[PDB]
Paper text:
Fatty-acid photodecarboxylase (FAP), together with protochlorophyllide oxidoreductase and DNA photolyases, is a member of the rare class of photoenzymes that require light to initiate each catalytic event. Absorption of a blue-light photon by the flavin adenine dinucleotide (FAD) cofactor within FAP triggers the decarboxylation of the fatty-acid substrate, which leads to the formation of a hydrocarbon molecule and CO2. The recently published high-resolution (1.8 Å) structure of FAP, determined from cryo-crystallo­graphic synchrotron data combined with UV–Vis absorbance spectra, revealed a bent oxidized FAD in the dark state. Forward electron transfer from the fatty-acid substrate to the photoexcited FAD occurs in 300 ps and is accompanied by concomitant decarboxylation of the latter, as shown by time-resolved visible and infrared (IR) absorption spectroscopies, respectively.
Author numbering: 77 to 305, 310 to 643
Amino acid sequence: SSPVAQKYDYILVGGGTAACVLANRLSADGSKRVLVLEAGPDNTSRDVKIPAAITRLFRSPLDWNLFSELQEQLAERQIYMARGRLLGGSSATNATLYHRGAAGDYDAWGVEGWSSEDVLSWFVQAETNADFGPGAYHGSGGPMRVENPRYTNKQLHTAFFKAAEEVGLTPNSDFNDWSHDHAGYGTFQVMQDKGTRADMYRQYLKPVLGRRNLQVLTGAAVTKVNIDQAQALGVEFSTDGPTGERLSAELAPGGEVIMCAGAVHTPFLLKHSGVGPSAELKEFGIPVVSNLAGVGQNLQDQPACLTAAPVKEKYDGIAISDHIYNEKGQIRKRAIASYLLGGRGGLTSTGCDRGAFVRTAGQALPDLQVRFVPGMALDPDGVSTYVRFAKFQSQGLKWPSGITMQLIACRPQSTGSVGLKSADPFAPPKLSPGYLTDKDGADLATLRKGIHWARDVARSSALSEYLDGELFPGSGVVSDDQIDEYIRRSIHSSNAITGTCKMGNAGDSSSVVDNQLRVHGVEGLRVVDASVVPKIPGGQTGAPVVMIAERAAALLTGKATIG
Ligand SMILES: Cc1cc2nc3c(=O)[nH]c(=O)nc-3n(C[C@H](O)[C@H](O)[C@H](O)COP(=O)(O)OP(=O)(O)OC[C@H]3O[C@@H](n4cnc5c(N)ncnc54)[C@H](O)[C@@H]3O)c2cc1C
Ligand SMILES: CCCCCCCCCCCCCCCCCC(=O)O
């Protein structure tokens, strides 16, 4: 009753990160009617705009609240996997860190037309950077806003860089400069606009919300993709939810459906639509249109553990939690003033924007990413500590001053999978991260060596001046076996998730889309989101998604070609 006798040249399944990019570029003429279905609500929450409010988005109504299956290798735990639920998707709920990884990450893709030389100009075209001048590696006319963090913890951040130098790291002045080595310590740039989150809704969708040929339905949960027998013809959805009407949106001649539901929901909606491994589809009675085995396989996510330690009493009050909460847990008006009046202060921080890439054992590229947080974790699950920090407000307690180092296997070898658990297209998918399952135990070894690394850093002269012992994992965790166990019981997502409908060369019986993002053996069906990533780059994945999305968009409108 919203697409009534209307036909669309492009239907966008999901209004997330890549979705926002595509709607902008494809609607930019006027001949193409574009439809954007988003299951979550509109992007208006003040928790979304303030970076420090990321603490409130986890396990909120703006999150899918996805929980993984039992992981037997993780002490029989279910792993919470944050995913954004609103216009702009995860770019509106994320830590705002801006990373491209290394050039070799894209060369390792092996896919024709998507080498590092091919992708570079698209990163740059999308970017306006407040702190690097225009060059081969940075842009100034682009829709993204990228800036150095506008919060510095004068004492703890400098101690961290002194400690990294003391144990033998060198600085990296730009982790996204492919002209030098990825490894090193420094400051991560952030996808922010003078301290306001610069998510893809704000940067791409919101400016073009006036075009008459662009229709953006929120509260619109898609259930399947109409594939008449093979050629897609539209989608089915519901504006109320599981207890609503089954609306249908038709496509114009030549109209294409583009999946933008993310690496969790795109392979899931594809399986409900008959695109998947037949054995899995038969088990729920779904007709097989395309029998591609890679739909849902190859899920890559970057697991994390942490160390945490308090400052000496002589340094009580210098952590970021002391810049946000007062001793009774209410937000300090000084922090509120600095944010609103100047875009400065603790409120501009997602907390984990300084760090390092380290090779734990002479790998071709760093296997370890370090995120230093000048606040003290109180749960070894770093996501849980963020949730706990939100609910700590006004509770009348003083959050203790300290530091945390989060350790991330950033180029992991373990792969996971996404599947069906019900025939209910509104049921949660069958989600298995598969952390620590690679046959060599390289991911466990990366994280275990990360713990040793962080302890050496904590023991340096520069940090030992500030620190007073260690809370996590603590004095009791001494042997490699104990470290390994501590990791199994605390490991959490650094929140990537890529690879579940991967792209590849013709004759890749393992891939799902071709180097032009069309799914094999279906007409008018393309995937443009984090699913198509064949091998996760080092670092956080939001920026490469935007790059894939800009490049797709230009390909569809004949501005560029691939191969
Ligand atoms: C908590 C968190 C922290 C992160 N931190 C960072 C970081 O610091 N830096 C960074 O670069 N990356 C980060 N990431 C990752 C980055 O945000 C994502 O990798 C990227 O945004 C993925 O883009 P996408 O378009 O593939 O998916 P999304 O942006 O998630 O888009 C998918 C969209 O599809 C919608 N959808 C799903 N199912 C349906 C349906 N049935 N009907 C309609 N709509 C549907 C969803 O609601 C969502 O809006 C973070 C991720 C999260 C979750
Ligand atoms: C932004 C406000 C800072 C709050 C500080 C809380 C104390 C520090 C806990 C650190 C835990 C490790 C970092 C986990 C980061 C999770 C965010 C993400 O992965 O998207």
